Amino acid sequence: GLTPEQIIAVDGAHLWHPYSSIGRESPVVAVAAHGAWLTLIRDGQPIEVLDAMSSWWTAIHGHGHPALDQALTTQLRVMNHVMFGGLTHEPAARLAKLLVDITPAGLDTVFFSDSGSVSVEVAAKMALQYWRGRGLPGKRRLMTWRGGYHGDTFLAMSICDPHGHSLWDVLAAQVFAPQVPRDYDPAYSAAFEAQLAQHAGELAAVVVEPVVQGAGGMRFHDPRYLHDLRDICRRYEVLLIFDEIATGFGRTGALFAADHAGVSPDIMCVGKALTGGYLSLAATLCTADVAHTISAGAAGALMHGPTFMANPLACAVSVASVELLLGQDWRTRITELAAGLTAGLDTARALPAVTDVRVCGAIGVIECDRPVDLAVATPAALDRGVWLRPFRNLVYAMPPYICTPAEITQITSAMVEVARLV
Amino acid sequence: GLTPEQIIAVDGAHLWHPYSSIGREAVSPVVAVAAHGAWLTLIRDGQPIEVLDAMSSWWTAIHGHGHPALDQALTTQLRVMNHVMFGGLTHEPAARLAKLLVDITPAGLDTVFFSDSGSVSVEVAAKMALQYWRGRGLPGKRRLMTWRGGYHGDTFLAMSICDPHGGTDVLAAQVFAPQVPRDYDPAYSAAFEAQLAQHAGELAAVVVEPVVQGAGGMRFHDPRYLHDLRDICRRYEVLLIFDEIATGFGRTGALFAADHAGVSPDIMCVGKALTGGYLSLAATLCTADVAHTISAGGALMHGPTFMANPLACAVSVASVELLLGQDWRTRITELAAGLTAGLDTARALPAVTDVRVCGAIGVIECDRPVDLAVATPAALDRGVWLRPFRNLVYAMPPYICTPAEITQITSAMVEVARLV
Numbered sequence A: 001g002l003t004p005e006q007i008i009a010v011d012g013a014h015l016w017h018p019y020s021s022i023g024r025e026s027p028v029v030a031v032a033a034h035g036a037w038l039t040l041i042r043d044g045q046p047i048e049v050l051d052a053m054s055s056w057w058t059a060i061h062g063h064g065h066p067a068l069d070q071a072l073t074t075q076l077r078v079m080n081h082v083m084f085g086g087l088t089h090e091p092a093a094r095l096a097k098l099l100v101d102i103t104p105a106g107l108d109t110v111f112f113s114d115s116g117s118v119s120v121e122v123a124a125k126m127a128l129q130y131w132r133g134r135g136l137p138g139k140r141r142l143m144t145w146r147g148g149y150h151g152d153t154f155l156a157m158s159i160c161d162p163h164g165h166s167l168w169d170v171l172a173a174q175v176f177a178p179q180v181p182r183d184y185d186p187a188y189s190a191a192f193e194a195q196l197a198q199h200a201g202e203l204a205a206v207v208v209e210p211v212v213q214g215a216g217g218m219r220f221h222d223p224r225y226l227h228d229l230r231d232i233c234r235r236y237e238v239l240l241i242f243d244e245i246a247t248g249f250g251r252t253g254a255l256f257a258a259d260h261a262g263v264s265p266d267i268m269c270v271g272k273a274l275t276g277g278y279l280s281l282a283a284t285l286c287t288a289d290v291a292h293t294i295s296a297g298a299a300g301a302l303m304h305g306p307t308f309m310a311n312p313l314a315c316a317v318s319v320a321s322v323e324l325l326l327g328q329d330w331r332t333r334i335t336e337l338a339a340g341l342t343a344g345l346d347t348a349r350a351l352p353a354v355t356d357v358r359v360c361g362a363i364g365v366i367e368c369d370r371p372v373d374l375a376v377a378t379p380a381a382l383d384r385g386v387w388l389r390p391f392r393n394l395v396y397a398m399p400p401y402i403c404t405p406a407e408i409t410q411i412t413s414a415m416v417e418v419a420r421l422v
Numbered sequence B: 001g002l003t004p005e006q007i008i009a010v011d012g013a014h015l016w017h018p019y020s021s022i023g024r025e026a027v028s029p030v031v032a033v034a035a036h037g038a039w040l041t042l043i044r045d046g047q048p049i050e051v052l053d054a055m056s057s058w059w060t061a062i063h064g065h066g067h068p069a070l071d072q073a074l075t076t077q078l079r080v081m082n083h084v085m086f087g088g089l090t091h092e093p094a095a096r097l098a099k100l101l102v103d104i105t106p107a108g109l110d111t112v113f114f115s116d117s118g119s120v121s122v123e124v125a126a127k128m129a130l131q132y133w134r135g136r137g138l139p140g141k142r143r144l145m146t147w148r149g150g151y152h153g154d155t156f157l158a159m160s161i162c163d164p165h166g167g168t169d170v171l172a173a174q175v176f177a178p179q180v181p182r183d184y185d186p187a188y189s190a191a192f193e194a195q196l197a198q199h200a201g202e203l204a205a206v207v208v209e210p211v212v213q214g215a216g217g218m219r220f221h222d223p224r225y226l227h228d229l230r231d232i233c234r235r236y237e238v239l240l241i242f243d244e245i246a247t248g249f250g251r252t253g254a255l256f257a258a259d260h261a262g263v264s265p266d267i268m269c270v271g272k273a274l275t276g277g278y279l280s281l282a283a284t285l286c287t288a289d290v291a292h293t294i295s296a297g298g299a300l301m302h303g304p305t306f307m308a309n310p311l312a313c314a315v316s317v318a319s320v321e322l323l324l325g326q327d328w329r330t331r332i333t334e335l336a337a338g339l340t341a342g343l344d345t346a347r348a349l350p351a352v353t354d355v356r357v358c359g360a361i362g363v364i365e366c367d368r369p370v371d372l373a374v375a376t377p378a379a380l381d382r383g384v385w386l387r388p389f390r391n392l393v394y395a396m397p398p399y400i401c402t403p404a405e406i407t408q409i410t411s412a413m414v415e416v417a418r419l420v
């Protein structure tokens, strides 16, 4: 049993954190999460704050949600897990159907896995094996544009932003296109196609985050670009792959950002909010064509099998979550979060340190001119009862979908002061 | 809701399986619903029959499914905190587990980087090696050296040190020594050193599974090899990485395989059996030295989303503590012993080529590929879930299995092996 002063001592000593260095920077103890609220121990005392980041994209329905909690315990009463090797089960099949149907059409197979990162490698694997089935070992490189993020595994890092993972001669060398504009310039697509053109025969795929680039720098672009990529890929026989591991499940404003242009990719990756922030789970989806080409090509299978593939607990709770999203009118509300952030953040545009304000669904961004100092911003936000984690020059929120209108006021307002704080 | 045949219908069209296909059986997956204790309830004649698991749903279920202590620890944590982001936040589960893992692991492994699966923890481990040598300003040290026979996960970095035969050349070219033999040969170790030697100034790390090679042939080898390797790495200034995602937590007879050689590695991976089989959770442990060398190159550049997931950890604490509040060594010994007897009659069968038993791990190795379409329905008729691989008929039972259940699994095994 451990006190907060014990967690803190045990933590510093023995735990890594993300982009962390044992012995530098300073985490804060969490002791409860419920609905849209955390209990952080600050100065010996428990305090209430809004999970403004949805624990990095995952708590779409907030923490401790009755439907999601129950999906778990009841699953736990029946079956906790079985190897997915030679075995199948109800949550895997329900999630799959659910996934197959609510996704960009044509995506009707489902490869389950445990993290976004792995979910990405699997997609690569499909792509590579796909063309190997099609007698084109030549196709094995990955074209993307700049500012993208796809996880911290050595292949995913490979299509992460090179001049800003992080810059590595150890990752694969991939085709990068320059950085995709916010507004629709038809000439960027032109350049993109021309680049892909010199590389077509050796490009197994093009990987992209649809409409919104998350950890790359909370950047948006015009939904008409994905239309251009679809065609470009279609006319050059290059697979198109969406990484919807951040965008997915209502976050941008539609069900998947892909749907903002009504485009369907050959391969799709989803994670983060898939289980409503309860457990690690990912999925990788591909069109029947891609799957029938793997199976039938040499090796006759997709050589990938995680130990916890299709884990019943993870699926079960995810069934709830997905169902929960679909069974309410999610569209009206994401819109209203968008409304709420837009109104609440507009004041930030008149601040000297603020370079841009952008909202897209339940995604509110304040781009500054300096990098934001977590040493000042984090207390600040905490002082105003909100969990905020700036990154680079961005002060952003990605609230749980069940935040009340006033709860979205707190969040926008706390963000504003942080920005004002320079 | 959803019936078995719907489940199968949907599964056929829409589901990928481990290293499987979409469209080609020639064995339709058997429906599970439910699964608990050392037993899984399976549907295959359109009827619910319980069978021993066997394995441990692939090393996962070391304390059984639906174990009360482990169901309660999850029950508990779920109620007060399901998950928070570990960027900027810490929680009790993480701390309690880190403390537990740091204390039970081979001496010197002092920090824990949580991730989501065995494969990620492996890649994380290599990141630790390669970032390690760059902070020593020796950036050329960026390949890996390993045994043949090995398995370390399915992501492409992990695939580059897998036994080049199973488990297309676009992976990292790594240094492969020959297969580590079963019995101790001083000559093998020296030949390993001579080889390591010539690539050592460009090797960041040796990477292996201590004592037991899991998914790559179910092979056992003599522990003093690891101790040879610890020495070989010490002298040529290459880090040692042990992959204890399979061997961890008592499965081979000691709390960790590395304890047979009585040697610590520099960096270390576990998982699989980490949560007691409930949830995907991995761990990478490295020494203060690697840790400190890392933070002076400027930090360990990896951060999964569900890092230190409070539910996966609270259950893991339950499982690790549970493991340790009982004479687990005796319990495994009996498993080894009861298994040893069990699979004995096999060695005379014409098919069988070898019979070996390490900790709670039992293998009948065969002449020919095992035609699972004969085998899987056969062991199921003996009330066991049994999934052979190539020419191997093996198992890894829950520690809660009883001498009776153990004989029931070992029987079924021998018979599948007679069935050629």
Ligand SMILES: *Cc1c(COP(=O)(O)O)cnc(C)c1O
Pocket (backbone or CB within 6 Å): A115, A116, A117, A118, A120, A149, A150, A151, A152, A209, A214, A215, A243, A244, A245, A246, A247, A271, A272, B303, B304, B305, B306
């Ligand atoms: C978070 C994320 C990943 C990696 O997922 P993990 O679960 O952190 O491994 C990959 N791609 C995108 C777009 C993401 O947002």
Ligand SMILES: *Cc1c(COP(=O)(O)O)cnc(C)c1O
Pocket (backbone or CB within 6 Å): A305, A306, A307, A308, B117, B118, B119, B120, B122, B151, B152, B153, B154, B209, B214, B215, B243, B244, B245, B246, B247, B271, B272
């Ligand atoms: C099972 C296993 C892994 C990887 O496990 P996943 O979580 O399935 O990636 C790695 N190494 C060894 C030795 C294993 O047994």
Ligand SMILES: NC(=O)c1ccc(-c2ccccn2)s1
Pocket (backbone or CB within 6 Å): A082, A083, A084, A085, A086, A305, A306, A307, A308, A309, B018, B058, B167, B215, B389
């Ligand atoms: N999740 C699973 O059921 C499995 C993961 C890996 C499996 C495996 C891996 C190698 C050989 C035989 N089975 S089975």
